[PDB]
Amino acid sequence: TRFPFFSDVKGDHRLVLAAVETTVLVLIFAVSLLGNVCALVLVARRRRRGATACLVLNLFCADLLFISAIPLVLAVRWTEAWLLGPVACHLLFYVMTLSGSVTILTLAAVSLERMVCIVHLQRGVRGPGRRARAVLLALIWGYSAVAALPLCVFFRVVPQRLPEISICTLIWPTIPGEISWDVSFVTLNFLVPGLVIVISYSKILQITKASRKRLTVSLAYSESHQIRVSQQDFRLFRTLFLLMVSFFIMWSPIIITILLILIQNFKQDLVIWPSLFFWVVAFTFANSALNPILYNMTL
Amino acid sequence: QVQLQESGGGLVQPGGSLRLSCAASGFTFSNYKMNWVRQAPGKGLEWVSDISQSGASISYTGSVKGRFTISRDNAKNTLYLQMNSLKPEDTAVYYCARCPAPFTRDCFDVTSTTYAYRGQGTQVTVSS
Amino acid sequence: SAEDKAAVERSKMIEKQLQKDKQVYRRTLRLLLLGADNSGKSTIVKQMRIYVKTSGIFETKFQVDKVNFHMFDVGAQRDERRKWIQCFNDVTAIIFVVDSSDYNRLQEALNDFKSIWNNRWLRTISVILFLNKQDLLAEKVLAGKSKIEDYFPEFARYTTPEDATPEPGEDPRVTRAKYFIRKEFVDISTASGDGRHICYPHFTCSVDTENARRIFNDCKDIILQMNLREYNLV
Amino acid sequence: LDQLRQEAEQLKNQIRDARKACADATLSQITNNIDPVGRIQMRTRRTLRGHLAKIYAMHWGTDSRLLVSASQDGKLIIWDSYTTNKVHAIPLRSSWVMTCAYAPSGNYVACGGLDNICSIYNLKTREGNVRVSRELAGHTGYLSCCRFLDDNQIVTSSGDTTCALWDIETGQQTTTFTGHTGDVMSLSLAPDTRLFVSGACDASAKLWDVREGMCRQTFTGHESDINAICFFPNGNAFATGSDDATCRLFDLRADQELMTYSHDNIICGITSVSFSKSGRLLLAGYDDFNCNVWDALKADRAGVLAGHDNRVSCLGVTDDGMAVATGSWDSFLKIWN
Amino acid sequence: TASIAQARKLVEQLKMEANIDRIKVSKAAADLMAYCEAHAKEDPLLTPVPASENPFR
Ligand SMILES: O=C(O)CCc1ccc(NCc2cccc(Oc3ccccc3)c2)cc1
């Protein structure tokens, strides 16, 4: 047998569990939609000047594309089987992966440009213009849409006996191809952006702390003045650590789940509730509601 | 028609005391911050003291600390200065001054080029 | 039609020119110079330079490390300042020069700085404070002819802080005087306790060379604070 | 000295009594049966973009189609307001420009500021280029306002407490008007163009005869600096804006103040004033970032124009009466109708 | 001698001003009302015009 993605059979208490799942998902969907619409409308009034506030548009668009896969999942959870057809089983996971990869890479690019523009604006050099933004967005979308083809090519509907009904599952041609895709995707879409984010925010913190010291080392205000000067940098220290750890808290479980699935397909000793997979996905769908706050909370 | 008229002053033996009273008309007295300035023979204009819109913030120059006090009656539209233990170097002409704008905490009112909202001053002489 | 196409072509040419001009306007830094007649701000202008009758304003241009500074000085105006000072609400910084070795017109400088700090249209603008003519201050303190306590009585009980690190070679009396005078200005600086804008003080002489570098570094710090506040991080 | 001061006091008291012996009734009493104008609502038609920094002044042409604006980045732009096409963009020599004007014949424009100089620009050149033709010099303080009378005569007011009338073709002042004590902030020309009025940052206003060069009447009543002034359409009244958050209607024949426009909420000063074609509305611009529309005969606010982001600094109404243009410190012009 | 000149100029200007004719407030108020009521039907801002005659629509 093979893993029943999104497909599991409920016992006597099907109604209660189904109601809980549908309520959770519809609430998440509504809140995320409202948040991203408000953020888009708010950043749409900036026709006056914006250089660092252009990729945030791409981020919010990716979130609104990501949150769109709720209804199909709800249908499959309610009707307990694949009753949709090959097209949906070909499109769903591909669209979800495209949206996720876009979100991650956009976060990385925003942080890197903030860090690099704190410096070259201080050196009086021309900032990146329309051409740089166009090239960057084109490369990001192209790589995202080329690196996730197997989920649209190899996902298919077959009949099987659920641990007989029809299920959407994934068939690979060879083990090396599957393992290579898993390893390369994980390493080039989760690890490198994390390093970039952490390094950028760490060096911003270093420079700010170094700048705050010359007010006493060199200019030498007083001993009772340096307290009266800042009184407010704790907000910056809190915000930087918050933005640094949110990425690694709210995007790791799905990677762990992917690795567990591959291990199961390599060793048969494991067993996992499909409800666990559903709940992991429902937890990941909260990024689409959290992102438009952490990047606008102090506005 | 803004008007600021002074009263008091005169001749005082050293170590004496006296009082300066200024009456204001033509504006709502309570919205404005008020000052006392003075001009000494053969010198420019100098700042002496100031009081804010209620009386909760008072400031003096270093040469008159512990000697001169200022007060403000908003009902009687009047500004007061009390002088104790005078010196021969306190002989001058005294003007009362008003800030240009209301609801504000800064001044630009020491100039010679005929600042508009200022009085004609009184003479205070200390010698014997 | 047949005429409207020419009008749109005209407008497009004008827009192209405007874009090319914005490219260079957004890249220079503007500074406003302030002081009094007994100061030495003209010497600062002359030192930084090699690096019409009834004219109302003067401009001086220089560059450091391929960054371009335009410094503006006010020429022939009247005594009052509460009207033409509003034109300068978007400059990067205000450079304020004070003659620190007279003891008689130092209260005027305090009052002027205190009135600039609190103006409604100049609440976001930072100030770089130069305290010129320090050798005269050293000689005057060492002479003993005039006493500071005659104008600031609270100097009669000011002790130099223990954690302070003096410059080598100083006589402790001179260091007392210097530290007291600088504290008198930083006290007004921080009494708001806001964080929008800051005051950077220095001690400079009549023959000096590193003033341009000081302005460069303080401008760098100012630009950094703006960049942090722009990204919503603070 | 003392006798002269006493005589001045006696003359002031006599003038005060002569004024007070005329207020037999108030403007409100005469106008207690006037139907109100109700609510007034206006919407932006065009938003004009292109300046790089804040805007200090604007002026409408006589054709009611083309307008001129001046910004502090050092440029002077001439727009067509029907299609938002830029007809002209002239670069200046000094960037601290405070005023602008538009010749009634449509051939010239002018500008000035902290450089103490008034510059004249010729638009109708056979070579198709705009070039400086005249620089007028002789003031010893910054320039506040300037207004053409015809193609050859121009009247200016400076921040050295003076106003002047200039002959452009020769280049020399022909008369100087003196008597103010503070910096002159604004002036305005009469419809017949034989008198003007001036308000000058010492809480007083004056009426000047152009030809003779002396002062006819002086008007007091405010209590801080005066920022704007303009004529009522028939040329027998004028409105004043100040820094104590109050506008005031003054008359010329009764020789005293007629009306005060204020509210207990406003604690910010007025930066611009202008009337309407029939005089039934008075429009004002504020430091609160929004403009106010007042009924001018009953002293009841009747509308708000509230679409700007920063301080509102200039305000204008066309000669036929179809649109209102506002300009502010965020570098955007707007047209309302 | 600045005080003498200033005082003399002020006295002469006040004397020049204090000898002018004045009318009552009622006549001026009536004239202002008359001008406003005579030109009421031609102020577009007070009486909006149809969208055909409006060039900014
Ligand atoms: O080992 C295997 O064969 C692969 C297992 C496998 C596991 C899950 C899926 N579903 C796609 C899916 C579902 C939910 C959120 C998603 O978002 C992201 C995923 C990765 C990186 C960034 C975002 C993707 C597809 C395949």
DSSP symbols for A190-214: IIHHHHHHHHHHHHHHHHHHHHHHH
C20: contact with A, CB 8 A cutoff: no
Strands D281-286 and D270-275: antiparallel
Domains of chain C: 31-230 (3.40.50.300)
Asked if B124 contacts B9 with a C-beta cutoff of 8 angstroms, the reply is yes
In the chain, the amino acid numbered D81 is S
- Distant-in-sequence, close-in-space partners of B122: CB < 8 Å, separation ≥ 6: B6, B7, B8, B9, B20, B93, B94
SS3 A95: helix
Question: Which contacts (CB < 8 Å, 24+ apart) does range C163-166 have?
Answer: C163/A223, C164/A220, C165/A220
Which residues fall within 8 angstroms of residue C53, CB to CB, at 6 or more apart? none
Interhelix angle A287-294/A55-66, nearest 10 degrees: 160
User: Is there a contact between E43 and D321 (Cβ–Cβ < 8 Å)?
Assistant: yes
Pairing of strands C126-132, C199-203: parallel
CB D273 within 8 A of CB D284: yes
**Contacts with D216 from chain E: Cβ below 8 Å:** 17, 20
Selecting from D87, D140, D182 the residue whose C-beta is nearest the C-beta of C76 gives D140
Cα distance between residue C105 and residue D246, in whole Å:
39
Q: Which of helix, strand or coil describes residue D245?
A: coil
C-alpha–C-alpha distance, residues D107 and C29, integer Å = 37
Contact B101 D224 (CB under 8 A): yes
Residue D141 and residue C54: Cα distance in Å, rounded?
9
Q: Is the CB of A97 under 6 A from ligand 1?
A: yes
Phi, psi of C67 (to 5 degrees): -125, 135
Question: What DSSP string runs through C210-225?
Answer: -HHHHHHHHHHHHHHH
**φ, ψ at D205 (rounded to 5°):** -135, 155
Nearest CA in chain C to A226: C190
Q: Which residues 33-72 in chain C show a CB within 8 A of chain A?
A: 65-68
In terms of Cα–Cα distance, which of D268, D257, D248, D261 is closest to D301? D261
| Alpha-carbon distances of E2 from B119, D89, E6, rounded to whole Å | 18, 49, 6
- Would you call B106 and C115 a contact, using CB atoms and an 8 Å cutoff? yes
Cα(A138)–Cα(A54) distance, rounded to whole angstroms? 14
Report residue D150 as tokens.
């015809």
Residue A253 backbone class (left: φ over 0; alpha: ψ -120 to 50; beta: rest): alpha
Q: In this complex, which of C14, C25, C90 lies closest to D89 when CB atoms are compared? A: C14
Q: What's the CA gap between C124 and D275, in Å, rounded?
A: 36
Q: How far apart are alpha carbons B117 and B100 in whole angstroms? A: 8
Tokens 């790089």 correspond to: D52
Q: What is the distance between the alpha carbons of residues D218 and D198, in angstroms, rounded to a whole number?
A: 10
Question: Residues with Cβ < 8 Å from A48, sequence gap 6 or more?
Answer: D330
- Judged by CB atoms closer than 8 Å, whether chains meet at C68 and A52 is answered as no
Give me the amino acid identity at E48: P
C-alpha span between C41 and C99 (Å, rounded): 10
User: Do B62 and C107 lie within an 8 Å CB cutoff?
Assistant: yes
Kindly determine whether residue D15 and residue E14, on different chains, have CB atoms separated by under 8 Å: yes
Sheet holding D281-286, edge to edge: D270-275, D281-286, D291-295, D301-305
Cα–Cα dist D111/D99, whole Å: 6
User: Is the distance from CB of D125 to CB of C88 less than 8 angstroms?
Assistant: no
Q: Is D307 on the interface with B (CB under 8 A)?
A: no
> Rounded distance, CA B31 to CA C13, Å?
54
Q: Which two three-digit tokens encode residue C44?
A: 């600062």
Task: Sort A274 into a burial class: Cβ within 10 Å, 0-12 / 13-18 / 19+.
Answer: middle
Residues β-bridged to residue C96: C34, C129
Give C52's contacts (C-beta < 8 A, 6+ positions apart).
D137
D106 phi, psi to nearest 5 deg: 75, 15
Q: Which residue owns the Cα nearest ligand 1 atom 18?
A: A100
Cβ neighbours of residue D53 under 8 Å, at least 6 residues apart? Answer: C90, D71, D72, D73, D331
Phi, psi of A10 (to 5 degrees): -100, 155
SS3 content of chain A, % helix, strand, coil (to 5): 70, 5, 25
The CB of A193 under 6 Å from ligand 1? The reply is no
Contact D250, D17 (CB under 8 A): no
Q: How many helices (H) and strands (E) does chain C have?
A: 6, 6
Block residue for tokens 């005929």: B114
- Kindly list the structural domains of chain E, giving each domain's residue range(s) and its CATH number in brackets, ordered by start: 4-56 (4.10.260.10)
Please state, in angstroms and rounded to a whole number, the distance separating the CA atoms of residues B111 and B46: 10
Q: Does residue A81 contact residue A165 with C-beta atoms inside 8 Å?
A: yes
- Report chain D residues whose CB lies below 8 A from the CB of B28: 223
- Chain D CB within 8 Å of residue B30 CB: no
Q: What residues contact C228, with CB distance under 8 A and at least 6 apart?
A: A118, A208, A236, C234
- Residue C231: CB atoms within 10 A of its CB come to 17
Closest CA to D161 of C80, E29, C199: C80
Long-range contacts of A19-26 (CB under 8 A, 24+ apart): A21/A74, A21/A77, A21/A278, A21/A282, A22/A74, A22/A77, A22/A78, A24/A282, A25/A70, A25/A73, A25/A74, A25/A282, A25/A285, A26/A70, A26/A74
Task: Give strand pairing partners of D173.
Answer: D166
Residues on chain E touching D296 (C-beta within 8 angstroms):
36
Count the alpha carbons within 13 Å of D37 in the hemisphere toward its beta carbon.
26
Rounded to 10°, the helix A86-120/A192-217 angle is 20
Structure tokens at C107: 């209260």
Cα separation of A153 and A89, whole Å? 10
> What are the tokens at C45?
């202008």
H/E segment holding residue C107: helix C106-117
What is the C-alpha separation between A221 and C219, in angstroms, rounded? 19
Q: What number of CA atoms fall less than 13 Å from residue D327's CA on the CB side?
A: 25
Side-chain-side CA neighbours of residue B121 (13 Å) = 13
Q: Report CA C177 to chain centroid distance, whole Å.
A: 22
Ramachandran bin of C133, using left for φ above 0, alpha for ψ from -120 to 50, beta for the remaining angles: left
Question: D27 by DSSP, 3-state: which?
Answer: helix
Cα D3 to chain centroid distance, Å, stands at 39
Cα atoms in the 13 Å half-sphere on the side-chain side of A222: 17
Residue D251's CB is within 10 A of a number of other CB atoms, namely 22
CATH topology for the A13-295 domain: Rhopdopsin 7-helix transmembrane proteins (1.20.1070)
Q: Which two tokens stand for residue B114?
A: 């005929």
Query: Any contact of C with E, at least 3 CB pairs below 8 A?
Result: no
Tokens 């690190």 belong to residue? C165
> Burial of B98 by CB count in 10 Å (0-12 exposed, 13-18 middle, 19+ buried)?
buried
CA E8 distance to own-chain centroid: 31
State the Rg of chain C over Cα: 22
Give the neighbor-by-neighbor strand order of the sheet with D195-199.
D186-189, D195-199, D205-209, D215-219
CA nearest ligand 1 atom 5, residue: A258
CA of A163 to the centre of ligand 1 (A): 22
Question: Are D187 and D197 a contacting pair, CB within 8 Å?
Answer: yes
Is the minimum distance from the CB of A261 to ligand 1 under 6 angstroms? yes
At residue D19, φ and ψ (nearest 5 deg) are: -70, -45
Which own/partner pairs from D4-9 qualify as long-range (CB within 8 Å, at least 24 positions apart)? Answer: D4/E4, D4/E7, D4/E8, D4/E10, D4/E11, D5/E7, D7/E11, D8/E7, D8/E10, D8/E11, D8/E14
The token duo for D171 is 């280049």
Classify the C-alpha dihedral B89-B92-B98-B100 as positive or negative.
negative
Pairwise CB contact (< 8 Å): D278 & E14: no
Which of A153, A179, A188, A254 to mutate for ligand 1's pocket (most ligand atoms within 8 Å of CB)?
A254
3-class secondary-structure state, position C62: strand
Q: What is the identity of the amino acid at C110?
A: L
- CATH number of the domain at B3-102+122-126, out of 3.30.470.20, 3.40.50.150, 3.50.50.60, 2.60.40.10? 2.60.40.10
* Residues shown for chain C: 234
**Sign of the dihedral through C-alpha C97, C100, C103, C107:** positive
Count Cβ atoms within 10 A of the Cβ of residue D26 and give its class: 0-12 exposed, 13-18 middle, 19 or more buried. Answer: middle
A86-120 vs C211-230: helix axis angle to the nearest 10? 160
Q: What is the CA(A276)–ligand 1 centre distance, in A? A: 14
Breaks (C-N over 2.5 A) in chain A follow: 163
Question: Which atom of ligand 1 is least distant from the CA of A178?
Answer: 3
Rounded distance between C-alpha atoms, residue E40 and residue D295, angstroms: 13
Resolution in A: 3.1
**C-alpha distances out from residue A283 to A98, A278, B99, Å:** 18, 9, 62
Residue closest to A148 by CA, chosen among A189, A209, A192, A199: A189
Task: In whole angstroms, give the CA distance from residue A272 to residue B3.
Answer: 90
Following DSSP, what letter does each residue of D260-300 receive, concatenated?
A: EE--SS--S-EEEEEE-SSS-EEEEEETTS-EEEEETTT--
Domain range holding D13?
Answer: 1-336
Residue with tokens 């409800």: A275
What is residue D211's DSSP assignment? Answer: T
- E25 CB neighbours in chain D (<8 A) are 22-27, 251, 254, 256, 258
Compare all CA atoms of chain D with the CA of E8 and give the residue at the minimum distance: D4
| Phi, psi of D157, rounded to the nearest 5 degrees | -135, 135
- Here the tokens at position C126 are 């930072």
Q: H/E/C letters for each residue in A236-287?
A: HHHHHHHHHHHHHHCCCHHHHHHHHHHHHHHCCCCCCCHHHHHHHHHHHCCH
Smallest CA-to-CA distance from B18 within B4, B7, B3, B2 is with B7
Under a CB-based contact definition with an 8 Å cutoff, are residues B33 and B79 in contact? no
How many other C-beta atoms lie within 10 A of the C-beta of residue C210? Answer: 11
User: A129 exposed, middle or buried (CB, 10 Å; 0-12, 13-18, 19+)?
Assistant: exposed
Taking the C-alpha atoms of residue D326 and residue D314, their distance in angstroms, rounded to an integer, is 6
Distance of CA C21 to the CA centre of its chain: 28
Q: Spell out the residues 6+ positions from residue A13 whose beta carbon is closer than 8 angstroms to its own.
A: none
Residue matched to tokens 């073709």: D169
| Residue D332 burial by Cβ neighbours in a 10 Å radius (0-12, 13-18, 19+) | buried
Atom 14 of ligand 1, residue of closest alpha carbon: A281
The total number of structural domains that make up chain D? 1
Q: What is the dihedral of CA A173, A177, A181, A182, to 10 degrees?
A: 80
- Longest Cα–Cα distance of chain B, Å, equals 45
Amino acid at site C32: L
A97 CA from centroid of ligand 1 (Å): 6
CA dist A122 and A207 (Å) reads 13
Cα D203–Cα D209–Cα D214 angle in degrees, nearest 5? 75
In chain C, the N- to C-terminal Cα span, in Å, equals 54
**Alpha-carbon distance E32 to D238, whole Å?**
12
Nearest to C152 by CA among C201, C187, C116: C187
Which CATH number covers residue D47?
2.130.10.10
Burial classification of residue D296, based on how many CB atoms lie within 10 Å of its CB (0-12 exposed, 13-18 middle, 19 or more buried): buried
Please indicate whether residue A147, judged by its CB atom, sits closer than 6 Å to ligand 1.
Answer: no
Contact D68, D109 (CB under 8 A): yes
Q: Which amino acid is at B75?
A: A
DSSP string, D162-204: EEEEEETTTTEEEEEEE--SS---EEEE-TTSSEEEEE-SSS-
3-state helix, strand, coil in chain D (%, to 5): 5, 45, 45
Residues 6+ apart with CB under 8 A from D144: D98, D99, D157, D158, D159, D183, D184, D185, D186
What letters, b where the CB count within 10 A reaches 16 and e where it falls short, cover A65-90? bbbebbebbbebbeeeebebeeebbb
Tokens matching residue D62: 């006589």
Contact D324, E45 (CB under 8 A): yes
Query: Contact at 8 Å (CB) between E8 and E1?
Result: no
| D141 contacts D159 by C-beta, under 8 angstroms | yes
Which token pair is A52?
Answer: 């660092």
- What the block records as the tokens of D137 is 């010099």
Q: Which chains touch E (3 or more CB pairs under 8 A)?
A: D
D293: closest CA among D311, D310, D281, D307?
D281
Token readout for B17 is 């005391």
**Ligand 1 contacts CB of residue A88 (under 6 A):** no
Task: Report residue D245 CA to chain centroid gap.
Answer: 17
- Chain A and chain B touch, per 3+ beta carbon pairs within 8 A: no
Method for structure elucidation: cryo-EM
Interface check D221 vs B, CB under 8 A = yes
Question: How many Å lie between the centroid of ligand 1 and the Cα of residue A136?
Answer: 24
> Number of Cβ pairs closer than 8 Å across C and D?
61
